[PDB]
Amino acid sequence: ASVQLQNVTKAWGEVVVSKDINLDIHEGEFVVFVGPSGCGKSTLLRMIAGLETITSGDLFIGEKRMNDTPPAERGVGMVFQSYALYPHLSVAENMSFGLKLAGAKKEVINQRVNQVAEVLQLAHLLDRKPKALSGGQRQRVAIGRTLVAEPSVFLLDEPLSNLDAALRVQMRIEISRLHKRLGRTMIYVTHDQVEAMTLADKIVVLDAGRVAQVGKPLELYHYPADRFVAGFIGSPKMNFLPVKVTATAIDQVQVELPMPNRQQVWLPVESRDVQVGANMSLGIRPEHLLPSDIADVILEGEVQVVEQLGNETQIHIQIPSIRQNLVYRQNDVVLVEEGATFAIGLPPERCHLFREDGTACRRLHKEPGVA
Amino acid sequence: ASVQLQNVTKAWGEVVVSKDINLDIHEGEFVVFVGPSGCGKSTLLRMIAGLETITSGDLFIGEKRMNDTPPAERGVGMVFQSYALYPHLSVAENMSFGLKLAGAKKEVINQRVNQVAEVLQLAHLLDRKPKALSGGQRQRVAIGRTLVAEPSVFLLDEPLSNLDAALRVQMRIEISRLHKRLGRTMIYVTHDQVEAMTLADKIVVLDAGRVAQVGKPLELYHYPADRFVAGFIGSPKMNFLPVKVTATAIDQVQVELPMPNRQQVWLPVESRDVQVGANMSLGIRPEHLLPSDIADVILEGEVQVVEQLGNETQIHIQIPSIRQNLVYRQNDVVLVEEGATFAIGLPPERCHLFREDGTACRRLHKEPGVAHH
Amino acid sequence: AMVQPKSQKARLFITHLLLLLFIAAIMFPLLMVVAISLRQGNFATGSLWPEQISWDHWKLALGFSVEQADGRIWPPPFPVLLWLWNSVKVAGISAIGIVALSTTCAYAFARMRFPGKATLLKGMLIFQMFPAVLSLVALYALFDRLGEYIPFIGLNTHGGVIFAYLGGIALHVWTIKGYFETIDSSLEEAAALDGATPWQAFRLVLLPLSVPILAVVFILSFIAAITEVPVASLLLRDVNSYTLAVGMQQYLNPQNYLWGDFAAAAVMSALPITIVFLLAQRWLVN
Amino acid sequence: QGEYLFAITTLILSSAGLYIFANRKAYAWRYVYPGMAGMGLFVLFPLVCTIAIAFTNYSSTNQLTFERAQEVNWGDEKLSPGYTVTTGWKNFTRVFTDEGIQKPFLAIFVWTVVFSLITVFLTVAVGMVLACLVQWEALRGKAVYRVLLILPYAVPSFISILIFKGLFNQSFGEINMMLSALFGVKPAWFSDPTTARTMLIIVNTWLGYPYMMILCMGLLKAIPDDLYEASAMDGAGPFQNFFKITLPLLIKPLTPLMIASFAFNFNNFVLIQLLTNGGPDRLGTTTPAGYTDLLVNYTYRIAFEGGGGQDFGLAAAIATLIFLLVGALAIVNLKATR
Secondary structure (H helix, E strand, O other), rough: OOOOEEEEEEOOOOOEEEEEOOOOOOOOOEEEOOOOHHHHHHHHHHHHHOOOOOEEEEOOOOOOOOOOOOOOHOOEEOOOOOOOOOOOOHHHHHHHHHHHHOOOOHHHHHHHHHHHHOOOOHHHHHEEEEEEHOOOHHHHHHHHHHHHHHHOOEEOOOOOOOHHHHHHHHHHHHHHHHHHHHHHHHEEEOHHHHHHHHOEEEEEEOOOOOOOEOOOOOHHHHHEEEHHHHHOOOOOOOOOEEEEEEEEEEEEEEEEOOOOOOOOEEEOOOOOOOOOOEEEEEEOOOOOOOOOOOOOEEEEEEEEEEOOOOEEEEEEEEEOOOOOOOEEEEEOOOOOOOOOOOEEEEEOOOOEEEOOOOEEEOOOOOOOOOO | OOOOEEEEEEEEOOOEEEEEEEEEEOOEEEEEEEEOOOOOHHHHHHHHHOOOOOOOOEEEEOOOOOOOOOOHHHHHHEEEOOOOOOOOOOOOHEEEEEHHOOOOOOHHHHHHHHHHHHHHHOOOOOOOOOOOOOOOHHHHHHHHHHHHHHHOOEEEOOOOOOOOHHHHHHHHHHHHHHHHHOOOOEEEOOOOOHHHHHHHOOEEEEOOOOOEEEEOOOHHHHOEEEEHHHHHHHOOEEEEEEEEEEEEOOEEEEEOOOOOOOOOOEEOOOOOOOOOOOEEEEEEOOOOEEEHHOOOOOEEEEEEEEEOOOEEEEEEEEEOOOOOOEEEEEEOOOOOOOOOOEEEEEOOOOOOEEEOOEEOOOOOOOOOOOOOO | OOOOOHHHHHHHHOOOOOOOOHHEEEEEEEEHHHHHHOOOOOOOOOOOOOOOOOOOOHHHHHHHOOOOOOOOOOOOOHHHHHHHHHHHHHHHHHHHHOOOOOHHHHHHOOOOOOOOOOOHHHHHHHHOOOOOOOOHHHHHHHHHHHHOOOOOHHOOOOOHHHHHHHHHHHHHHHHHHHHHHHHHOOHHHHHHOOOOOOOHHHHHHHHHOHHHHHHHHHHHHHHHHEEEEEEEEHHOOOOOOOOOOOOOOEEOOOOOOHHHHHHHHHHHHHHHHHHHHHHHOOOOOO | HHHHOOOOOOHHOOOOOOOHOOOOOOOHHHHHHHHHHHHHHHHHHHHHHHHHHHHEOOOOOOOOOOOOOOOOOOOOOOOHHOOOOEEOHHHHHHHOOOOOOHHHHHHHHHHHHHHHHHHHHHHHHHHHHHHHHHHHOOOOOOHHHHHHHHHHHOOOOOHHHHHHHHHOOOOOOOHHHHHHOOOOOOOOOOHHHHHHHHHHHHHHHHHHHHHHHHHHHHHHHHHHHHHHHHHHHHHHOHHOOOOOOHHHHHHHHHHHHHHHHHHHOOOHHHHHHHHOOOOOOOOOOOOOEOOOOOHHHHHHHHHHHHHHOOOOOOHHHHHHHHHHHHHHHHHHHHHHHO
């Protein structure tokens, strides 16, 4: 059940949507696909399923080349956005169409559908038709159809776009329960990073059909591969400060802050392929910004927005000689009037240094939870 | 100007969506409407605008009672859920339709549209059609049409509902600056707690068409009036614990946690109309839960779910004798494996008590920021 | 339920008055043709609206009796029941053929794709509004040439009119295609995932969902074949082979004008209007 | 000869359609073929045969192809006794150069264009206004109004046309006596060509307004209502809303429907063959003609009427009817892609 996309390339006519997507999903990994462009993730999932041809490269479901295998024999079950429920068939027929067509004994069909309905809380409605059901019940019917089919790999689209929040949460809970109950390989496609953060063993970030980074949720949060991933992960975008590198050591890089005092910080960074005097973009997460009293590096500025959310206060301060307003998050309700001057602290350890191309030098600082 | 509502009731035949609601919006106040997915907020906004008849009650804008006045003469401008842009007309005609209908002075009509486009940076696509525009551009065009109409009261029906997160945040800042500039009365309808607490000067929480509580955002967050408002405000649901009152003081009320620990704790509360041995519900927010080391109340429990968002750790703890799992939330990454015992502190100061009927007794702990303005 | 000024009542009253006047104007012909049916005379002379009820023309069309008025007997004028039987036969056969030949074309044009889809679709659009008329010369020549070889579709027979009516495939193809497009798009992909050959996916999933549109198309084709004058009038030379809209034209002849008999037959042909107004409208959200 | 032609139809349909079921690449063509073959046999073939006849001299004297060998004829097998002369554009030229057919042809072509244009305009106006009035949402009995207004559509066309032919009679008449009783006038519907054209126009409007009403009702349902809400907020009245919100958003999708209605009214053989049968005769026409005869009816007169001589080759006139029709086809196809 180890899907092993290797050098997979897709070109819609002349437009190459996907180029050299090297994914290695081991057995029983809840790998999630999240990115800004929804076309790329859905196209990738459909090519994995078999509904779409692969322009070049080889695909490996389990341990067998499954590039040209018809979708029926790939051993994969897909949950569509519309759930693909047949209105004329009942719930039992909807979740046992596969067994009916291939040819299965009535007893086997009954046993499978009863087990799936019992574990999905679907037996009390196993006479009705899709029209006489609710949204959550339709979703459970689709998941039950996949469960009855018993696929090696579970594939799931993103129906949250056309769906509201209550059954979005119901979807999230049901998917979590299915994963913990089964433990089989399952791929999921979403556009919201919160869902990927909450439910994933290996997040795949797709950027215009390119593998931006593949890793654990905390791995992406703590050690982003590039500026795109760093900005994408985390609802408040990480503050980016253009810096000039002064001196590079073997384990750290010294950069000059753009703000007029030209302070220099010896932040811990891989310090590989770094030239003195080059242009680089420093990145510090809003949550990691220390109070001005605790940190040696102090960044003065003028407060613009003081959004108070009760649990936390997001302060948008406009640092002189910096275009961006450095957003700052503090727990509790800090009191600050708009237009006043507020100072924040810069922790050198939590500083992400980004090359001019976009790649990020590895942060030598150890972070708990990354394992 | 100052829109005032007195005993406004809307009856959809047998059902009554809104019943006996009383609002007092002063001139220049930013008032938001929040609540569940029920159409009570939208119906209220349409009744204020004049697009829906009022079954009973009186509606006052300024001094005139506009219960039976057509929306044209109410002096109220509204941007709809859809942006309501005429596809056949250009941007200038879209934002000057009303002026073209009413006045015939091309000089003043182009003066107004030019001023509004300049203050809304809409000068460059003045000649384009709404189809060519993006979502944010359509939102700005609708706002520009309202500005050109120049109403006494601005109405907004979920304007930030057809945009992605970044655009929604940016146009939220735009609406904030718009209110800061004009200072005219503005009314907003939304489902988003973040938008409500960021924009509104006063927040009206509608429950099935009933005004549960009206007040400042931090006031609602710190001192909810009832269980509904308390549960609604805050992105995570507040933990609720059934309790039994043992003794009542002049300003403190003891409760008994339903645990074999049998612990009794004093909580600073109004202590009025409280009966000894009455089944009530304690409420403490997940954010205010303290680590077990620095709190004398300790709630030992088994960890069910650990969600590591990266900037905070949400730990769902199953207290043995409590039905609903306790939700905790410590900033940063808190390494705790599932199925392991955990203990959290319960600070008595940040506690809310709710009687069986649903109403809440006001806390006596002074919270910072409750009176910033 | 927006608040409106006092002008709303005046507008509503004026609109109601205008609509009532227009409805009276449009219903004048139908109400009259009902009124003639009960008139005793057949030359429509005297009381434009007959207060007396006669039913002489109705049973003449029904053939129930001869309605003895004087000593001599008035036999039934024309076999309206025979007209109805022939029309029903031709319409049923034509509708069955149209549905059978249209369902697969609509499925192919709506759901699955092929390199010639675009050009074929423009072709059907081009040839859809080409009328069955303007080719009656070719049809007459073709049936005259085929009379000696295959008589069952030659001249003066129902085979010819049935074959001519089978040319209405184009109109119904687009309707069935529209319904198939309305049906959700992921069903075929899902059925393929369970292992259904595309033929099975069409037959076991898509076909049972098309029953309402197939019935609607059948009803529409039946009505259209019933009410087609030109082709059936050009063909069907014999009196016994007449259908409706072909044997009906004999009623209004300068030699023997029969307003009463024609009106009785027209009103008796009431099933068409009810069937259309009910099923074709299908009480759809307009 | 005809047996080989059936073999030609076989070679075109069964062959080159067996490739469809043989080649596995063409699988959707397996679904396409049933119905495509039906069209090719029932619609395309009559058109091709009509085009072919125009180049022949098939007539009343030459109705047979070659069966006449001994049955009987001054020609000794040069042109006429052959009975299947390939005239080669002689019939097409005879439409123009003969001038005994050219003048009636132009006259009735102008009449057909005027008839179709006036009918389409009146029908669209009536349907649009009726749709807007019916879909007010403040009216009472909207369903009853819809039923009563679409009753003319539901009633079969031939029944209504024959009812109108009976009513508009002048020998006995019903409308004539009604009008005479109200204020003594005898419009002379059938006798006067102008009155006959007026009767045809009003009958066609009566027959066709409900269809455009249904289409306009669908289009109004398609149009949103937030635009009307905003216009009412600015203070727009009913007429202002109709003339600056609905109509600008209505003509853009109405145009292809208007062109299709133009084509349909340009070839409505049944409003005339049943009501006026050709209208007051024209004077000094070799081929039969009438002051009210859409081209389609003219061609029928030349082909099948006994007085017309049954000149099938002349009665084709295919390169006129189908050529303006195909101009309309291209226009409609372009408008649909808009």
